[PDB]
């Protein structure tokens, strides 16, 4: 055994000793209990970043732990290969997106092998392979024929200069963020997942997710947005039926979730495209220009309520079917057309949004709900206004004194008896568009025929192969400019036909890849019939916090889709959910990267003083991206993982510090020297076992700290997922070992038990150095020894 810790000597040797026995290559073995640990799989950006190292060390800690407890542990790894970054790296660097993507993957696969993640590399997957995306092309056609996937004209944002569809996250003051040119709303056909058909199941099955964080569950419920409310019809007054036609001249229909406040409505609001707005603006230009203002706007859903609520009145009036008060119709910029009836009512006294609206326009505020003896301030908002569970009605005639639940059913009875109302279930959730007017994505298996319509490619001819010998220039979809691709014969008649030149949303691959891992080479379907049974669903999912409302919901949706096609049994894909914290770092300018910078703050190369700015998430914007490759080169893979799991709990954010990195290194040198100096003073012994009534009190108390730590470390991996405190518990166990005289026959057998357990508890964190130190203390296979057991006799 070497006297000093040389991680470059042991880490690659321990890795080949791990490939020799193939410990992480798992198969369907129903003898050992299965455990499917999954890390969110990365995009081939080029090289790994510090955020990647956290995610995959958290997952490797959990996997190496469960595996040490005798589990069949599947920890697969793949590549989210499609996406725009390969297209921009193609436009700039004059490479093909495929050639760029494959060059990126092989470097990152080397970096991952350098960190020692016990990944089943025999299940590796790349989404840009026809071996993979054929199955989402296959699922497309099956659901397309079933109607769950369909084609319809929706409105999109077109950038006329840079020539591509844009998302509202990229629309700044009506102009694209790259060209800066005024964008045009356009009605193009798109393919849609009918996720609204699965809205109720996607909601109720959240309840069965016992180990999901209710913080995340709540977010899904709100994006789904189920609401039990009332559909009310306000009759158009005889003085305002002009311009309208049919039912629009007879009445105005609204939906409300609080019809127990129908007596409190003081004004209604329609959308800009509502016929009421078109009839009123027929001669009023300020109304015409306001309707034009709302249409040009492209307010994102992430910023949907950030907009100042505005609106002009119409001069037209409707009649409340209850109190009979004649209310004025308003055009408003929050009533969305296509989001239900396209027109709402407004009770300023009990909706905070309608309160801020009425105060803006001096519109009346009729209180109809009272909650106790509280004073109603018609000029200040109070929390007891929007109450739905504790208020009884007032200023409502016969409805005074009912709870909201009885007042709901009461108003429903009156409105239904007239025909002016009805109760209705509604969902904020809208269908899912998956059409990307880009190239580097999964093509859509639809062939257009002027006689047969939009026919899908049959399973025979799948996959519809995406050409890799393409370099996007920048002007529009490169596939629409390739007749050698889109020119084909119609599969339903034989005539000339164009393939669909759009590609699917890169979200599609991420919504089912965890199922492909179970049988990544299976040629007869998405997931093998036999392997989806043994693995069931993912037992642990670790990833970032970005796009949880998006991705996590889609995986839940695809799972239920695939479950309705005999492919899988489970209703839910992920059992346990852990979201890591971002890895942040300080920023420097003169933006200078922290790697080539030193502190007093001067440049590493020139000694040129550069100023230090605030810390951001590790990004390329402010040049704070710390390269984990440089980190491994300095101290090694063990020091990297140890620091990542020690600086903070996985949920909490992580401040990168160069000294804290060096602190994790010195602990490993201390752990190295500790085991060495023990073996220098007389080799190895057999670890202590059994009754202790006979040991010295100085040793009885160390066996206490031992099996106290052995329990706290097990609890910190399996229950709390607090790997930082787990490292601290082992450190304390070591600190008392150093203060204890172990130079006796019994003192040695305890020091073995202390050290044989300490290396095993820290193995999931730092497997290389622990595997090495374990080999010097015991010749049994470390996994044959298993997770350290807790002796309760040492605790009493
Ligand atoms: Mg359950
Ligand atoms: Zn045809």
Author numbering: 1 to 590, 599 to 608, 618 to 813
Copied sentences from the primary study:
To correctly aminoacylate tRNALeu, leucyl-tRNA synthetase (LeuRS) catalyzes three reactions: activation of leucine by ATP to form leucyl-adenylate (Leu-AMP), transfer of this amino acid to tRNALeu and post-transfer editing of any mischarged product. Mechanistically similar to other adenylate-forming enzymes, the class Ia aminoacyl-tRNA synthetase (aaRS) LeuRS charges tRNALeu isoacceptors, which are essential substrates for protein translation. We have solved crystal structures for all enzymatic states of Neisseria gonorrhoeae LeuRS during Leu-AMP formation.
To understand the role of this peptide-plane flip on the global conformational changes and its effects on enzymatic catalysis, L550 was mutated to an alanine or glycine and the crystallization of both mutants was performed. These mutants gave rise to the same crystal form as the WT protein by seeding. However, while the NgLeuRS-L550A diffracted as well as WT protein crystals, the NgLeuRS-L550G showed slightly lower diffraction quality in the range of 2.7–3.3 Å. Comparison of the captured apo and pre-transition states of both mutants show the same large domain movement, including closure of the active site by the CP1 hairpin and structurally associated α-helix (M84-N93), that were seen for the WT structures. Despite the occurrence of these substrate-induced changes, including the shift of the priming loop, no peptide-plane flip was observed in either mutant pre-transition state structure. To further investigate the catalytic role of the L550 peptide-plane flip, the NgLeuRS-L550G mutant was tested for Leu-tRNALeu formation under steady-state (multi-turnover) conditions. A 25-fold decrease in the aminoacylation rate constant was observed (5.8 s−1 vs 0.26 s−1) indicating an important role of the peptide-plane flip in LeuRS turnover. In the first assay NgLeuRS-L550G showed only a twofold decrease in the kcat/KM for Leu activation relative to the WT protein. The transient kinetic analysis unambiguously demonstrated a kinetic defect manifested as a 31-fold drop in the single-turnover rate constants for L550G mutant as compared with WT NgLeuRS (1.7 s−1 vs 52 s−1).
